[PDB]
Design a protein around this ligand. Structure first.
Ligand SMILES: NC(=O)c1ccc[n+]([C@@H]2O[C@H](COP(=O)([O-])OP(=O)(O)OC[C@H]3O[C@@H](n4cnc5c(N)ncnc54)[C@H](O)[C@@H]3O)[C@@H](O)[C@H]2O)c1
Ligand SMILES: NC(=O)c1ccc[n+]([C@@H]2O[C@H](COP(=O)([O-])OP(=O)(O)OC[C@H]3O[C@@H](n4cnc5c(N)ncnc54)[C@H](O)[C@@H]3O)[C@@H](O)[C@H]2O)c1
Lengths: 344, 341
């Protein structure tokens, strides 16, 4: 029984990983999540009553609390997903994205290093530190036939991605300097169940259901690779448990879809699944408003080496996602309510 | 006349830049240095009396103080050389290298943003944020014919290089994101005047003058490009005043020299400049016991800024300096330098 420590385990992706591990594995988990606006205990509820489940409300920047957790749970592995996507003001000190993403990764690295360093030769060679990053570190694509590979130079363009790139550099340097067994995975845009209402996909669905404008910028021609949450979760576990130390692996949905395609799809699916439309709406597609870049990943390394390929298609994943929303209204509503935060 | 704000101005490279500006330009400076072990006010003494000189003992991590400095001095340009080279453990909070190198670059970027955002359009466009980095961000070279170019992919191998790479990222992102006019320079290993005694080149000189062993490790065949501090300073001012927003420029000595070379060169130089050998020392050489190159064509091509000295030329000047400035290095070794003006 593997004990896995997962940071940001109460977030979108992290929660999916947790549900997977408990539902489709015999392993155990320890969730480390400070519970920001982004965290949601309701997404964990499904597997919260499990014996192999443990939760620690800790801040990755709290070295002491961190050491404790490591001491108490003795994880065999760490999967680092905790991160801040908001870029707040700098008027009162360093923003959270700098602290969490860069400072917090450093702290976690040091806390693990300490732990690892005191492990028996046996537990020592087996330990693994898995860092989750983003494909935004690769910057921009300068062609229509180029893809992001694990060897694309870094060229982060936003504070947030610059923040993530830094974390990656740190993770890589600990291994090379101190020998800490680290690995990294970069992924594309994820979508799926338990995705926050204000996000793109979920937003569209919900607005449509509400009979609200479906804002689409530019030509709506921006292309993205969409990776289904569940598929992401599966690949993470794979990389962790079988992935090779010092290696990086990109993880993608194996697709390229334009933004308009995304909205159309949702509309098309809604017509079928949500026949009865909002007041004074002929067709959902009537809501698409034009209030006017390509990003695609090459996940062949992982497929080749680890043999783990996505199980869904844009189409199958989208359908599932739309059904989820219609089925799990209590969730999204609680989140919109804000009442989710105050949950136990 | 431009008012340039230089962070780390009391450091090795920084002090050489300050001296150059005062001595060979008509511009003014505002030095921002917290004065850690690496800082030395004495390296600034020679020009400290100019009315074009200003010093602010401020930590780049202090948002309030930075705000005060920008507001009070109103620089036209920012040259950011402050960094922490020491990597130490830290059981509570981030270590200094993290705090200063990364968090501090962010702090400075935000303080500059706030300031520039309020400048008049004309001043706004003329504003420059020049960031100094290191060629260690590039990582390792795989051949013996390959050089580091501005476009080589980043692959920082150490905590420090990692911290520098991170800083580079933030600088680039600020431009792309907020429009802050930033530019970057990466350089190789510097040597020259006012270099700390504990350092390699300076160490070699002093140990030799003191009849101590000149430890040549390996076969002493590690290759490195050496850049003369003064040449570095002139290039930085050039980039900063005539460089292109959003570009990156590598700065090198235009050489490749093996460790033994260095050492031998020093000995050979002392034998001529320091004829008066130590006690029981016939020849300096007998003291001796037992790939990183940069491509700086861009800057030379576009900016036209090329190194003025040769390894030879440079080293000669370096030794002479050491011979001529015992007060300095001694006060460093003393520790008395930390209590200067
Ligand atoms: N969502 C995507 O499309 C996506 C794409 C590429 C890469 N990634 C990466 O995957 C990870 C998961 O992303 P996500 O959307 O699931 O994030 P998320 O925002 O949904 O969840 C982040 C979780 O981390 C927690 N957290 C924040 N700072 C913390 C701190 N200091 N200490 C402890 N916990 C803290 C929050 O409470 C939250 O539950 C992130 O590292 C992200 O960079 C995400
Ligand atoms: N020296 C080299 O060979 C070299 C090579 C490549 C790149 N660089 C770059 O050149 C720049 C200067 O290097 P150096 O060797 O001259 O440095 P240094 O170590 O000699 O000087 C550092 C200076 O920064 C000041 N400083 C440090 N922390 C500070 C903080 N938080 N707030 C304010 N001031 C602070 C110190 O007081 C000191 O005066 C750096 O950014 C470095 O990465 C140096």
């Amino acid at each position: 029984m593997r004990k896995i420590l997962i940071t940001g385990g109460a977030g979108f992706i992290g929660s999916a990983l947790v549900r997977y591990i408990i539902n489709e594995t015999s392993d155990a988990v320890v969730v480390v999540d400070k519970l920001t606006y982004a965290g949601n205990l309701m997404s964990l509820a499904p597997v919260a009553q499990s014996e192999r489940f443990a939760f620690e409300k800790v801040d990755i920047c709290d070295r002491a609390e961190l050491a404790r957790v490591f001491t108490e749970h003795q994880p065999d592995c760490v999967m680092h997903l905790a991160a801040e996507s908001h870029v707040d003001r700098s008027i009162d000190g360093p923003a959270a994205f700098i602290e969490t993403n860069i400072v917090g990764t450093y702290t976690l690295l040091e806390a693990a290093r300490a732990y690892w360093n005191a492990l028996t030769e046996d537990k020592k060679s087996a330990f693994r530190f898995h860092h989750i990053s983003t494909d935004e570190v690769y910057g921009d694509l300068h062609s229509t036939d180029d893809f992001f590979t694990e060897t694309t130079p870094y060229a982060p363009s936003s504070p947030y991605s610059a923040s993530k790139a830094s974390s990656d550099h740190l993770v890589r340097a600990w291994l090379r300097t101190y020998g800490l067994p680290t690995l990294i995975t970069n992924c594309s845009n994820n979508y799926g169940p338990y995705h926050f209402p204000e996000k793109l996909i979920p937003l569209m669905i919900l607005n449509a259901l509400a009979g609200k404008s479906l804002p689409v910028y530019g030509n709506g021609q921006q292309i993205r690779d969409w990776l289904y949450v569940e598929d992401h979760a599966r690949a993470l576990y794979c990389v962790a448990t079988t992935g090779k130390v010092g290696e990086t692996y990109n993880i993608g949905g194996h697709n390229e879809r334009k933004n308009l395609d995304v909205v159309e799809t949702i509309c098309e699916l809604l017509e079928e699944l949500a026949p009865n439309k909002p007041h004074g709406v002929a067709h959902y597609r009537d809501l698409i408003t034009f209030v006017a870049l390509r990003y695609a990943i090459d996940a062949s390394k992982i497929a080749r080496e680890l043999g783990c390929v996505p199980q869904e298609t844009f189409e199958s994943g989208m359908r599932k996602t739309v059904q989820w929303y219609l089925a799990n209204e209590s969730w999204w509503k609680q989140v919109q309510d804000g009442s989710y935060q105050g949950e136990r």
